[PDB]
Write a protein that binds this ligand. Structure first.
Ligand SMILES: N#C/C(=C\c1c[nH]c2ccccc12)c1n[nH]c(N)c1C#N
Length: 325
């Protein structure tokens, strides 16, 4: 019902800061930028590589689908607010196609190595280092009043050789205001907090912290995704087989959450599992008591009890990354 950190931070800022409908982007010319290669199409997006001919700075170009002005302003405004923030993808320009008049956003390029080939090779230290760096990103945007709402491996770009991390794709990010009711059609199925799966709209930054748990578990147990749901119903079932079904009803009770009657026939009764149930010889080298303590405190039904980004950065799991700063 209310975020445990930074709950009020947007109300203590100028309305200009969080009133995105009133933001006016200056739309440049999308012809100075020359497409090279469609690094993958998407929902309201298709993404390409290219060169700022005005000097030759490599870049990435995300071509919005302008049947929603408001979503466009929301994202532009949020990136304006996070410019130069710890580990956030730098937005360079906002542009449009002259003859076509369709808008687009231009992003610093990143030689990322694909998580599907990089998670195979991470050491126990790598995992702690990059997670810390993802945490810094999340504590920044949260303290700037903002929920990412789509934390997941594809949106955590990692240049292993430069040891750089950039969290990206802010087309779902949103200003947090207390008591505000949000859409649950955010985040990838596998990284959706249970609040979204039970349709509880009064959520907050703590959702990203669940998403981050999911990433952490997949990394130290090498099961990616960790909670591999078939749909939104099955996803909550997968979670409950691990966290226990009694500890789910307790949450719903606490927050007065109406449970769709279709869950009765499929939830069953499950006990809370031991996070050691997931260790085996292929991932033992990545799992430590301090790693499972962090994990237990990230993946909770009660979004309010979830470790914040700053609490998590303080965890002993990260003491190896602190000293090596
Ligand atoms: N995920 C993401 C983003 C781009 C991509 C989307 N599909 C891809 C497939 C292969 C290589 C890159 C991307 C993104 N947003 N901003 C950037 N510089 C990005 C990059 N790369």
């Amino acid at each position: 019902s209310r975020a445990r950190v930074y709950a009020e931070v947007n109300s203590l800022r100028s309305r200009e800061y969080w009133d995105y409908e009133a933001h006016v982007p200056s739309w440049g010319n999308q012809d100075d930028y020359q497409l090279v290669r469609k690094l993958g199409r998407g929902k309201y997006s298709e993404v390409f590589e290219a060169i700022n001919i005005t000097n030759n700075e490599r870049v990435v170009v995300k071509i919005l689908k302008p049947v929603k002005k408001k979503k466009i302003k929301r994202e532009v405004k949020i990136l304006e607010n996070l410019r130069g923030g710890t580990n956030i993808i730098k937005l360079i320009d906002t542009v449009k196609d002259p003859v076509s008049k369709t808008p687009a956003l231009v992003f610093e390029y990143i030689n990322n190595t694909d998580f599907k080939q990089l998670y195979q090779i991470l050491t126990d230290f790598d995992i702690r280092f990059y997670m810390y760096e993802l945490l810094k990103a999340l504590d920044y945007c949260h303290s700037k009043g903002i929920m990412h709402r789509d934390v997941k491996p594809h949106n955590v770009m990692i240049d292993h050789q430069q040891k750089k991390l950039r969290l990206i794709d802010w087309g779902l990010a949103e200003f947090y205001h207390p008591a505000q009711e949000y859409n649950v059609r955010v985040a990838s199925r596998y990284f959706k907090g249970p609040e979204l799966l039970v349709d509880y709209q009064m959520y907050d930054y703590s959702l990203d912290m669940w998403s981050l748990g999911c990433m952490l578990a997949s990394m130290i147990f090498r099961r990616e995704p960790f909670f591999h749901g078939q749909d939104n119903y099955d996803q909550l079932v997968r979670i409950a087989k691990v966290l226990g079904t009694e500890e789910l009803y307790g949450y719903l009770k606490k927050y007065h959450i109406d449970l769709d009657p279709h869950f009765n026939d499929i939830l069953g009764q499950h006990s809370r599992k031991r996070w050691e149930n997931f260790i085996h010889s292929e991932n033992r080298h990545l799992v430590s008591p301090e790693a499972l303590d962090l994990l237990d405190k990230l993946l909770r039904y009660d979004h309010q009890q979830r470790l914040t980004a700053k609490e998590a950065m303080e965890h002993p799991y990260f003491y190896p990354v602190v000293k090596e700063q």
